[PDB]
Structures are given as C-alpha cells and as structure tokens.
Amino acid sequence: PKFFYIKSELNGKVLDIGGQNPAPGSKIITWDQKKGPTAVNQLWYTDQQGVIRSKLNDFAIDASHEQIETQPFDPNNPKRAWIVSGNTIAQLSDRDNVLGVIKSDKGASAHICAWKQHGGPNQKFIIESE
Ligand SMILES: CC(=O)N[C@H]1[C@H]([C@H](O)[C@H](O)CO)O[C@@](OC[C@H]2O[C@@H](O[C@H]3[C@H](O)[C@@H](O)[C@H](O)O[C@@H]3CO)[C@H](O)[C@@H](O)[C@H]2O)(C(=O)O)C[C@@H]1O
C-alpha cells in the first residue's frame, strides 16, 4: 500500500531489483529512478515491524552473500531484517551495520553491501514517497 523509493545520496539512483527479476537471490543495484507501472522493482514498503520488503514479491533485503540480494523474509535470520533509521538503512539487530552503495568496477550498475557505519554519503539514503 504505502510504497517508497530508497534513493542513494552517492549517485542519486534508487535501490532496484536488477532486471526486475522476481526470483530470490536476485541482486539489488542502484538504477535511474523510474515512474509509472514499470517502477515496481524500485518500490518498497515496511511490514508491521518496520522491516523493508519489495513491492515486487514482498521479499526482504538480505546481506548473507557478497552483495545484497532479495530473499523471502525470515524472522530468525538477522541478515534479512533491515529498517529505515534516519538517513540510513540499518540492520534491525545492529544499527551500526548499515547498507552502502559501491560503484561497479566493470562498468556495471552500482551494487549494495552492508558494513560498519562510516558517515559518508555512500551509506546515506533518502526515502521518497511513491
Ligand atoms: C548481463 C546483463 O543483462 N546486464 C544488464 C543488467 C541485467 O539484465 C540485470 O542485472 C539482470 O538482473 O541490467 C542492467 O539494467 C538494470 C535495469 O534493468 C531493467 O530491465 C531491463 C533488463 O535488465 C534487461 O535485461 C532487458 O533487456 O531490458 C529490461 C528493460 O530495459 C529494469 O527495468 C531496471 O529497473 C534495472 O534493473 C544493469 O545495469 O544491471 C543493464 C545490464 O546491461
């Protein structure tokens, strides 16, 4: 219902499920903000507890692998509980661990990782209502 974009303060692009792939394990990148029907893979919402889910498949953000990917939500997996805290997307169980944008080294789209808060814009995001 209440959807929003998560925009990076590093490049101005938004969290986006690469190629709108609905399958679990799909990498989340930053891509030009889209508007209209096709923007679904860039739209997110928070469940009751405040955990971020994707409008595309209701999957959560997961940081179990090298780069963040979408995965079905699991209340027992600390790596799948991410919330909006100020201008940071922080881990529910560790506010010091936050998402950050890392530009591609091979001309690809930027990807996202989770690591200790270091105050730069790469770890800052703006929540934009749909
Ligand atoms: C190898 C490759 O295909 N690289 C492209 C990359 C991949 O397709 C995705 O990472 C697969 O998950 O997508 C890039 O663009 C991202 C945007 O894709 C848009 O959809 C594309 C789709 O990805 C293309 O494969 C398809 O041919 O056209 C679709 C529509 O243009 C999404 O709509 C958009 O939100 C982004 O996710 C990328 O940079 O990752 C382009 C790579 O060349």
Ligand 1 is surrounded, with C-beta below 6 A, by 16, 18-21, 29, 31, 41, 108-109
How far does residue 118's CA lie from ligand 1's centre (Å)?
Answer: 30
In Å, what is the CA distance from 5 to each residue of 44, 65, 75, 76, 107?
Answer: 6, 23, 23, 26, 24
Q: Are 55 and 25 in contact (CB under 8 A)?
A: no
Cα–chain center distance at 80: 11
Length of the chain: 130
Q: What is the spatial distance between Cα 111 and Cα 30, in angstroms, rounded to a whole number?
A: 6
Resolution of the experimental structure, in angstroms: 1.8
Among protein residues, the one with the nearest Cα to ligand 1's atom 39 is 109
Atom of ligand 1 nearest to the CA of 39: 35
CA angle 24, 25, 28 (to 5 degrees): 105
The domains of the chain are located at 1-130
Specify the long-range contacts of residues 49-58, CB closer than 8 Å, at least 24 apart. Answer: 49/81, 49/83, 49/92, 50/83, 50/84, 50/92, 51/80, 51/81, 51/82, 51/83, 51/92, 52/6, 52/82, 52/83, 52/84, 52/89, 54/17, 55/3, 56/17, 56/20, 56/22, 57/22
At the topology level of CATH, where does 1-130 sit?
Trefoil (Acidic Fibroblast Growth Factor, subunit A) (2.80.10)
Atom of ligand 1 nearest to the CA of 27: 12
Specify which residues 83 forms β-bridges with.
Answer: 90
How far does residue 94's CA lie from ligand 1's centre (Å)?
Answer: 32
Name the experiment that determined this structure. Answer: X-ray
